[PDB]
Design a protein around this ligand. Structure first.
Ligand SMILES: O=C(N[C@@H]1CNCCC[C@H]1OC(=O)c1cc(O)c(C(=O)c2c(O)cccc2C(=O)O)c(O)c1)c1ccc(O)cc1
Ligand SMILES: [Mg+2]
Lengths: 618, 61, 338
């Protein structure tokens, strides 16, 4: 059930994998949650020179997070008094840097930027020797243990403990579930594969996967994000954020219309959400309150990302969306569009929260073509009870002309934020989910004439995905601290046991070993050592008494044994040697390093008359 | 080069400036060596089994 | 001018040919025609040394006719006690590509090297007991093919760079260099007195070198293909060569020409190694057909066969006290025969 880290020896393989992808750099690791955490552990507890630097980094980071100006003026001087007079007497800071910093300080002006010069110079001093000392250290070994896991993630229903239904749909239903791995609460969206083929939703389902993917990075509080995606023989599956509060179309039903003051809150959170999708070049195209969801505190998130669309490489032009909330350029035959669309939808939705229906929906009509015709023709008649600053905002959003609409003129999300309507709000505080929410929630056999081909299945071949920072964050806020300690105990115990066993040091050190680690021969698990001219192996006790030479190897291929991917070495003697691995990174690397090893070896021998194969038969 | 060719002539004069005995005398002297030392070559004149490490010898230094 | 010296280059080549023909009054096989044959020598394999995990490329007896070193594709040198099968030392090397090894006459040091292009010297008894490297020898720009000690502080290496070199092991520099061969040098053998040594190359020629003076006294052609191995006759006035053309040849220094050719028609593969017995009567040769053949040196008869390796006999050596022959093979085993 629980995560079991691989052994430290994984480093030999993992390092080479990472180095090949240029992922062993200060920037690449430091900018990762687990990378960061293991790095600071090293500097704080194991290198006295790096300690004050990281201590000071983390102190500046707390300052960046401070709500208001008067809290900062406090912390600003509070900061410059203490650590700084240790750092200036050390590793000095530059005049150039202290000049700007002290310039702002003297005037009593205190932005978050204030210390950014000091951030840069700290990195300069963290990324040199200090980093290379970290790479050598046992903590980078530990990073390599964790990264191995990340890149071996194969999900199935066994991994999740599914609870209750909280949403039906066309192709399947959304559930609520706990990932047994870490005990993190999630929502599982299970699309049935037989339902999908029956409705031809082939690009429709595979679209969502790509759309969820693009929006899930960044750590945003206002969009329902994906952490994983995977599939079983008869089902697709998304792991998404959990929201227990129901949707805003349900609460509109129970609350009736909302005030201006209440609609403002939702619009704020929805806006930031939209901004996030637009900056990453995605148009949502189905903004309605039914697609807006509430957590148990009352805060909201945009959710249903099936109809979403990428607009970077080419701008779309279809009539995608629900008929009450579609911008004029979406409906028109061959007119292209971008983020312009979602702003018109915002008007339509915001309007419905205030008056109980779309502005282009009248007499509770159920005629799609009539509702589309109001959009293109009808000037939106606004009530009198409405405020002036609200009239300001809505007739900006529902403005038919794209060039005359808020959020389209050049600054995008920023034009709407600085509208008169949101004059009271500190927008940072919105993003910090600190404003109080207005509403706090209270506490089949149709597809049996269709078969699943193995041609259909290839369409979802590259379905599975794991969003790195999301998995890393999950782990960080759950099992990470405790599992580090647990495997620290094992690794210390094995070494203590081996010290009693008169530890024989590594067989790889001192020689020209390319890399090494566990693999399984044929299943018999054995530790391998790949040398430039041979591949040895041993069992748990003695030095290698078995091997295979590089010159024997005809080809290194990849083949299936009981639906697990393996390596198929073809020996010159017509024989075959099969290797299995414990992780995908390992499979990728062995394949590579062997292909590189035997080709290099076989050419070197060609030159050597003493090692090459001379003629025999007449 | 001319250096590569003059190197050769100089050498080839060096090799021609050795003196040579007759193959009849040459062979005769080898055969004299074999015959002389044939008593001592244990692959021709075998020794007692107990004195041969690889047969029946028991005591060693 | 270029032509001018290429005519004298063959005028002198012909002066040498006819010089030698004036000595060819009889043949060794004629002189020896009178002596009793050695008769069938049926040597049985008395030890099998098992340890190496892959091909053996090179082996070398210690002066004490008891300990020997072997070098192997498995990245190790091993020093064995032939009398008992015991391993004295399993030395793991720093390069996997070894091709050669060599024991000190003293026995305090072994040496090895390969496609590393370096001749590494190991000290077999440090002031603790842990065996360690005592010197690398970088200098060659080609693979090390063979090497031999004169004493603790002097070694002689041959390389695929096409040269040989005499080293001063303390300083780690070359005292003397032996340019001359025009193809990869493959084996060498020291004259018993050490003042001379000979080499053998892929040019199909062996050369007698003047160790101290540093130059080529004689060149002996006659082979049709790469000469793989070479050995001095105990008295130092003649030597023997092994080649891919499927023959051995005995060359006499003072006669300055070929004396003898050992080659049955049925033997079509190459010779990888050659060594004389204590008296010099027998010539032992290792072959790519898995066999070692024993030749009557004087009569050119095949006196017997050492047959019991599953792959190429890659190397062989007679103990200083003539008690045993060693053969090393691509089957990964050494065997001591007598
Ligand atoms: O998105 C949620 N709930 C939505 C709210 N919107 C109103 C509809 C109910 C529910 O949506 C679904 O249950 C749902 C189920 C599905 O199988 C599908 C689809 O198969 C589907 C799709 O993936 C893409 C386009 C269209 C469809 C479709 O079913 O028509 C869907 O869009 C919604 C949701 C998300 C996270 C969470 O923790 C709790 C709930
Ligand atoms: Mg359009």
């Amino acid at each position: 059930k629980k995560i079991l880290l691989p052994e430290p020896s994984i480093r030999s393989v993992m390092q080479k994998y990472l180095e090949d992808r240029g992922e062993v750099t200060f920037e690449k690791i430091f900018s990762q949650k687990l990378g960061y955490l293991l790095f600071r552990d090293f500097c704080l507890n194991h290198l006295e020179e790096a300690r004050p630097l990281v201590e000071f980094y983390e102190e500046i980071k707390k300052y960046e997070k401070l709500e208001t100006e008067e809290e900062r003026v406090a912390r600003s001087r509070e900061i410059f008094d203490s650590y700084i007079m240790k750092e200036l007497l050390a590793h000095p800071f530059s005049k150039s840097a202290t000049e700007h910093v002290q310039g702002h300080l003297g005037k009593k002006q205190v932005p978050p930027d204030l210390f950014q010069p000091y951030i840069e110079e700290i990195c300069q001093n963290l990324r040199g020797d200090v980093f290379q000392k970290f790479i050598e250290s046992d903590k980078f070994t530990r990073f390599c243990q964790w990264k191995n896991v990340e890149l071996n993630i194969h999900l199935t229903m066994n991994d999740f403990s599914v609870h209750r239904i909280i949403g039906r749909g066309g192709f399947g239903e959304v559930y609520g579930c706990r990932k047994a791995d870490t005990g993190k609460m999630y929502a599982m969206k299970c699309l049935d594969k037989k339902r999908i083929k029956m409705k031809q939703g082939e690009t429709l389902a595979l679209n969502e996967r790509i759309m969820l993917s693009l929006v899930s990075t960044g750590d945003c509080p206002f969009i329902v994000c994906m952490s994983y995606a995977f599939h079983t023989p008869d089902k697709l599956s998304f792991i998404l954020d959990l929201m227990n509060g129901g949707d805003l179309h349900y609460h509109l039903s129970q609350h009736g219309v909302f005030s201006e003051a209440d609609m403002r809150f939702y619009a704020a959170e929805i806006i930031l959400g939209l901004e996030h999708m637009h900056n990453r070049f995605v148009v949502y195209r189905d903004l309605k309150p039914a697609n807006i969801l509430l957590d148990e505190h009352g805060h909201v998130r945009i959710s249903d990302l099936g109809l979403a669309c990428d607009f970077s490489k080419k701008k779309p032009h279809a009539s995608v969306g629900t008929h009450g909330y579609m911008a004029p350029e979406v409906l028109q035959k061959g007119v292209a569009y971008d983020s312009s669309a979602d702003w018109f939808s915002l008007g339509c939705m915001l309007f419905k929260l205030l008056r109980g229906h779309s502005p282009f929906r009248q007499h509770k009509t159920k005629d799609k073509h009539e509702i589309d015709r109001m959009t293109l023709t009808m000037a939106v008649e606004l009530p009198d009870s409405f405020s002036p600053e609200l009239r300001s905002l809505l007739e900006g959003l529902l403005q038919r002309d794209v060039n005359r609409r808020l959020g389209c003129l050049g600054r995008g999300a920023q034009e709407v934020k600085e509208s008169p309507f949101f004059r009271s709000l500190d927008w940072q505080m919105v993003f910090l989910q600190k404003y109080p929410p207005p509403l706090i929630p209270p506490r089949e056999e149709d597809t049996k004439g269709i078969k699943l081909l193995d041609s259909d299945q290839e369409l979802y071949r590259n379905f599975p995905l794991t969003i790195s920072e999301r998995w890393q964050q999950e782990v960080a806020e759950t099992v990470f601290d405790t599992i580090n300690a647990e495997t620290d105990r094992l690794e210390a115990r094995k070494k203590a046991k081996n010290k009693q066993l008169g530890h024989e040091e590594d067989y790889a050190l001192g020689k020209d070993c390319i890399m090494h680690g566990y693999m399984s021969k044929m299943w018999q698990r054995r530790y391998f050592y790949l040398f430039p001219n041979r591949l040895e192996w041993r069992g748990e006790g003695e030095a290698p008494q078995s091997l295979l030479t590089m010159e024997e190897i005809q080809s290194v291929e990849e083949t299936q044994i009981k639906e697990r991917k393996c390596l198929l070495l073809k020996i010159r003697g017509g024989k075959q040697f099969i290797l299995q691995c414990d992780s995908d990174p390992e499979l990728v690397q062995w394949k590579k390093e062997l292909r590189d090893a035997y080709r290099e070896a076989q050419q070197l021998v060609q030159r050597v008359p003493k090692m090459k194969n001379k003629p025999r038969s007449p | 080069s001319i250096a590569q060719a003059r190197k050769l002539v100089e050498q080839l004069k060096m090799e021609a400036n050795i003196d040579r005995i007759k193959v009849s005398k040459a062979a005769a002297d080898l055969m004299a060596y074999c015959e002389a030392h044939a008593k001592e070559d244990p692959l021709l004149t075998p020794v007692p089994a107990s004195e041969n490490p690889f047969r029946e010898k028991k005591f060693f230094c | 001018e270029l032509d001018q010296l290429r005519q004298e280059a063959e005028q002198l080549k012909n002066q040498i040919r006819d010089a030698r023909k004036a000595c060819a009054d009889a043949t060794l096989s004629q002189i020896t025609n009178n002596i009793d044959p050695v008769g069938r020598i049926q040597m049985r394999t008395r030890r099998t040394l098992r340890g190496h995990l892959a091909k053996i490329y090179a082996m070398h007896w210690g002066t004490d006719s008891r300990l020997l070193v072997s070098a192997s594709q498995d990245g190790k040198l091993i020093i064995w006690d032939s009398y008992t099968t015991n391993k004295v030392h399993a030395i793991p090397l720093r390069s996997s590509w070894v091709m050669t090894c060599a024991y000190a006459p003293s026995g305090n040091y072994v040496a090895c090297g390969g496609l590393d292009n370096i001749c590494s010297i190991y000290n077999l008894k440090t002031r603790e007991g842990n065996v360690r490297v005592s010197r690398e020898l970088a200098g060659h720009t080609g693979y090390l093919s063979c090497c031999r000690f004169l004493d603790d502080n002097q070694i002689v290496t041959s390389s695929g760079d096409t040269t040989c070199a005499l080293w001063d092991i303390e300083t780690g520099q070359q005292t003397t260099t032996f340019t001359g061969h025009t193809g990869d040098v493959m084996s060498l053998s020291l004259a018993p007195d050490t003042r001379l040594f000979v080499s053998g190359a892929c040019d199909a020629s062996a050369k007698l070198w003047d160790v101290r003076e540093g130059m080529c006294r004689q060149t002996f052609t006659g082979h049709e293909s790469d000469i793989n191995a070479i050995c001095f006759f105990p008295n130092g006035n003649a030597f023997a060569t092994g080649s891919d053309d499927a023959t051995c040849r005995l060359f006499d220094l003072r006669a300055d020409q070929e004396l003898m050719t050992y080659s049955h028609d049925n033997i079509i593969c190459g010779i990888t190694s050659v060594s004389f017995s204590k008296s010099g009567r027998l010539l032992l040769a290792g072959y790519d057909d898995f066999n070692c053949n024993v030749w009557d040196a004087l009569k050119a008869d095949r006196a017997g066969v050492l047959a019991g390796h599953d792959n190429r006999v890659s190397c062989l050596g007679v103990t200083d006290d003539g008690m045993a022959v060693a053969t090393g093979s691509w089957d990964s085993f050494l065997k001591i025969w007598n």
